[PDB]
Amino acid sequence: NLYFQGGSLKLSTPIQQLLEHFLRQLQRKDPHGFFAFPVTDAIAPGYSMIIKHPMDFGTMKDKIVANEYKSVTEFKADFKLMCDNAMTYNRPDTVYYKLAKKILHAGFKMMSKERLLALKRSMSFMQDMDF
Amino acid sequence: NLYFQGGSLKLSTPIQQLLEHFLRQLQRKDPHGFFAFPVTDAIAPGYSMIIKHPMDFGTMKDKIVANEYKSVTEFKADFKLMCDNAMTYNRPDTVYYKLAKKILHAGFKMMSKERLLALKRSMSFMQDMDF
Ligand SMILES: COc1cc(OC)cc(-c2cc(C(C)=O)n3ccccc23)c1
Ligand SMILES: COc1cc(OC)cc(-c2cc(C(C)=O)n3ccccc23)c1
Ligand SMILES: COc1cc(OC)cc(-c2cc(C(C)=O)n3ccccc23)c1
Ligand SMILES: COc1cc(OC)cc(-c2cc(C(C)=O)n3ccccc23)c1
């Protein structure tokens, strides 16, 4: 199943472009990859018993690639689920709890509707120009 | 002469926003301010005899503030006039000649219609989003 356009044989949406950008920036807060892959029962005994809805950055990346996010709010919800899971399974004295708390706070600030509107407004002048 | 809008008493165009940005970046290539002010006959004997149409970054800033640039091409022309003046009055062995040549080449690359189109296209996804 193909189509021909602009001299190229073919077959990335705005939301995919936005979420790919924010996911790369959030994963930079986790240089050791603690949040990069699903938590296994081997590394975290009882995890599958305690945490009913697991989430990780790698699973969110798969959702972006497959174009399964319909809103920023859905992305932020998955992000929040990951951080809440880490702050439920792990004790407050752990790197996982402390990092989840920092990531959750920083991510919600960075992706607020009000902030994205202000960034869009700052960029609008380039769309008003003809080049 | 005033008007009231959005609860504020009033009275910056896309081209003004674009040119203010590029002028700041071009002046960063001239940290000593050699191109920041008109060349005087005191600092450059015979300048007013040799150079018929003087130009400097400070004069270009005044034009931006006064909203006197109708195109990027007009801005690039003033920039080119400044660099050509420096490469006419000064010998090739001078910092002024060498800097003018570097500024001229870098400025034309950075402000090419093709580059600005590509930057506009990279940014378009944010204008397609609703926040
Ligand atoms: C110490 O090295 C690692 C590596 C890792 O994947 C690269 C993931 C984790 C990890 C991540 C988590 C999480 C996120 O809960 N975790 C909980 C208990 C024990 C380990 C982990 C730790
Ligand atoms: C230096 O100030 C700015 C302002 C801006 O929009 C307001 C956007 C950028 C900007 C930054 C970037 C980067 C970092 O990729 N970029 C890529 C394509 C088009 C614009 C930009 C830089
Ligand atoms: C060496 O210090 C300075 C300072 C300056 O203004 C801050 C401007 C110039 C300067 C700038 C120029 C130019 C641009 O032609 N010039 C030519 C002959 C002698 C001096 C200069 C030199
Ligand atoms: C990290 O990659 C990017 C990409 C971008 O547009 C493609 C723009 C920016 C960007 C950079 C900036 C800066 C540096 O001011 N900026 C300001 C307002 C809105 C957007 C941006 C950064």
CA distances (Å), origin A76, targets A8, A26, B92, B104: 36, 11, 58, 46
Name every chain A residue with its beta carbon within 8 A of the beta carbon of B15: 129
User: Do A120 and B113 make contact, defined as CB atoms within 8 angstroms?
Assistant: no
CA distances (Å), origin A124, targets A24, A106, A114, A120, B129: 24, 25, 15, 6, 12
b/e map of B102-127 (b: 16 or more CB within 10 Å)?
Answer: ebbeebeeebeeeebeeebeeeebbe
CA distances (Å), origin A122, targets A87, A116, B77: 36, 10, 27
Tokens for B10? 């009033």
Interface check for A112 against chain B (CB to CB < 8 A): the answer is no
Domains located in chain A, CATH noted? 12-128 (1.20.920.10)
Residues 16-45 of A with CB under 8 A from B: 17-18
Interface check for B122 against chain A (CB to CB < 8 A): the answer is no
Q: How far is the CA of A75 from the centre of ligand 1 (A)?
A: 22
Resolution value, angstrom units: 1.8
| Alpha carbon distance B50, B47 (integer Å) | 5
Which residues are CB-neighbours of A108 under 8 A, at least 6 positions away? A76, A80
